[PDB]
Amino acid sequence: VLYVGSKTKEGVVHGVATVAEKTKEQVTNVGGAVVTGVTAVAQKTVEGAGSIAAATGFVKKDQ
Amino acid sequence: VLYVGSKTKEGVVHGVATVAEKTKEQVTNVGGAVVTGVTAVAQKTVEGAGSIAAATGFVKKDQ
Amino acid sequence: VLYVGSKTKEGVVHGVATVAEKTKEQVTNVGGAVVTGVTAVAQKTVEGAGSIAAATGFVKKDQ
Amino acid sequence: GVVAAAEKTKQGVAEAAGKTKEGVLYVGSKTKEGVVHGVATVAEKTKEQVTNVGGAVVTGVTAVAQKTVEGAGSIAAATGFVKKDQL
Amino acid sequence: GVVAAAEKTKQGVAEAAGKTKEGVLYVGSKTKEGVVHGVATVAEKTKEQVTNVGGAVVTGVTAVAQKTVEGAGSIAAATGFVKKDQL
Amino acid sequence: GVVAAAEKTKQGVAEAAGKTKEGVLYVGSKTKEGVVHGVATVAEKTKEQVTNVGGAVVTGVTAVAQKTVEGAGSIAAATGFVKKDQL
């Protein structure tokens, strides 16, 4: 009834670093899903029935 | 009735780092899902019946 | 009725680091699911009947 | 000088005035490499007397900071030095 | 100075300037390399009396911080040095 | 000077200026490599007298920080040195 929010976080992704000092990487993906980078994904819903926040690097072949 | 939310976190991801000095990596993915990068995902779902949050590096082949 | 929350945490992931000096790695995934990196997934759900938070590096082949 | 309050209120919230650091802060190298800190003399009711008839007198607040000197026989910090070589 | 109160109210909650570090802080090298630190002087009722007929007198607070010197027979810190070699 | 309270309330909450560190703090090398710390001096009611003829008198508080010297027969710290070699 008397709501006082102050710096309240709801669905927050923060401070997501990566450091790659002299990193060698080779990818030869053929027909699939490959993720090697940083994915920082935050979400918030109201009346969000059946909601997903990440679908990183996946292969969907539903029949 | 008298609610004071102060600095309250609810579905929060933070401070997710990676350091990769001298790293060598090879990925030869064929038809699948490969994940190496840092994934940081938060979600605050209201009225979210049946809510996924991550789907990182998987293979869905239902029927 | 008289509720004050100060710096609370409901569904929080924080401080997740990896350090990989001199690290060599190979992944030869063929039709599967290889997760090798950081994941950090937090969730707070209200009225979320049947809520999943991680789907990391698996294979779903339901029939 | 900071101040915060909440007066004649039904449901009050004061505040910090304090630092937060919520995010990346890459530093390549946060190096001090020969520094000094803090030395500050506060003099009060002093009665110094100096009588020099051909030398050297200093009444400072000494502090030296260097990184590199070069050269044969060089001298870097010489507080109270008297160099009188016969040749 | 920091203040944060709550007065003449009906409900209250206050903060206080507390630091928070909620995130990533990479540092490559947080090095101190010859750092004299923490000294601080207060002089009161000083009664210096100096009489010099060809020397050196210092009344600081000697605090040296270096990293590198170069040269044959070099000298780095020389508080109270007399240097009178005969050739 | 930090103060943070709460008075005349139905339910009182008060923070207290406390540090938090909730996250990654990578440091590659948090090294001191020859530093000075914690030394401090305050002078009071001193009665220094000097009668110098060609010497050296320092009335500091010595504190040397240093990393590297080289050269043939070098000298690094020389508090109270009388270098008068004959040749």
UniProtKB/Swiss-Prot annotation, chains A, B, C:
Keywords: Acetylation, Alzheimer disease, Amyloid, Cell projection, Copper, Cytoplasm, Disease variant, Membrane, Metal-binding, Neurodegeneration, Nucleus, Parkinson disease, Parkinsonism, Phosphoprotein, Repeat, Secreted, Synapse, Ubl conjugation
Effect caused by changing residue 3 to F: No effect on osmotic stress-induced phosphorylation
Primary residence: cytoplasm
Region feature (4 X 11 AA tandem repeats of [EGS]-K-T-K-[EQ]-[GQ]-V-X(4)): 1-31
Binding site for Cu cation: 14
Entry keyword annotation includes Calcium: no
Entry-annotated residues carrying Phosphoserine: 51
Positions in coiled-coil regions: none
Gene Ontology MF terms: actin binding; alpha-tubulin binding; beta-tubulin binding; calcium ion binding; copper ion binding; cuprous ion binding; cysteine-type endopeptidase inhibitor activity; dynein complex binding
PTM description: Phosphorylated, predominantly on serine residues. Phosphorylation by CK1 appears to occur on residues distinct from the residue phosphorylated by other kinases.
Compartments, record wording: Cytoplasm; Membrane; Nucleus; Synapse
Repeat positions for Sequence: 6-20, 21-31
Organs and tissues of expression: Highly expressed in presynaptic terminals in the central nervous system. Expressed principally in brain.
Keyword flag GTP-binding: no
CC per GO annotation: actin cytoskeleton; axon; axon terminus; cell cortex; cytoplasm; cytosol; extracellular region; extracellular space
Effect the entry attributes to changing residue 17 to T: In PARK1; no effect on osmotic stress-induced phosphorylation; increases oligomerization
Domain comment as written in the entry: The 'non A-beta component of Alzheimer disease amyloid plaque' domain (NAC domain) is involved in fibrils formation. The middle hydrophobic region forms the core of the filaments. The C-terminus may regulate aggregation and determine the diameter of the filaments.
Disease tied to this protein: Genetic alterations of SNCA resulting in aberrant polymerization into fibrils, are associated with several neurodegenerative diseases (synucleinopathies). SNCA fibrillar aggregates represent the major non A-beta component of Alzheimer disease amyloid plaque, and a major component of Lewy body inclusions. They are also found within Lewy body (LB)-like intraneuronal inclusions, glial inclusions and axonal spheroids in neurodegeneration with brain iron accumulation type 1.
Protein family: Belongs to the synuclein family.
Function text: Neuronal protein that plays several roles in synaptic activity such as regulation of synaptic vesicle trafficking and subsequent neurotransmitter release. Participates as a monomer in synaptic vesicle exocytosis by enhancing vesicle priming, fusion and dilation of exocytotic fusion pores. Mechanistically, acts by increasing local Ca(2+) release from microdomains which is essential for the enhancement of ATP-induced exocytosis.
Description of how the protein assembles with itself and partners: Soluble monomer. Homotetramer. A dynamic intracellular population of tetramers and monomers coexists normally and the tetramer plays an essential role in maintaining homeostasis. Interacts with UCHL1. Interacts with phospholipase D and histones. Interacts (via N-terminus) with synphilin-1/SNCAIP; this interaction promotes formation of SNCA inclusions in the cytoplasm. Interacts with CALM1. Interacts with STXBP1; this interaction controls SNCA self-replicating aggregation. Interacts with SNARE components VAMP2 and SNAP25; these interactions allows SNARE complex assembly and integrity.
Protein name stated in the entry: Alpha-synuclein
Gene: SNCA
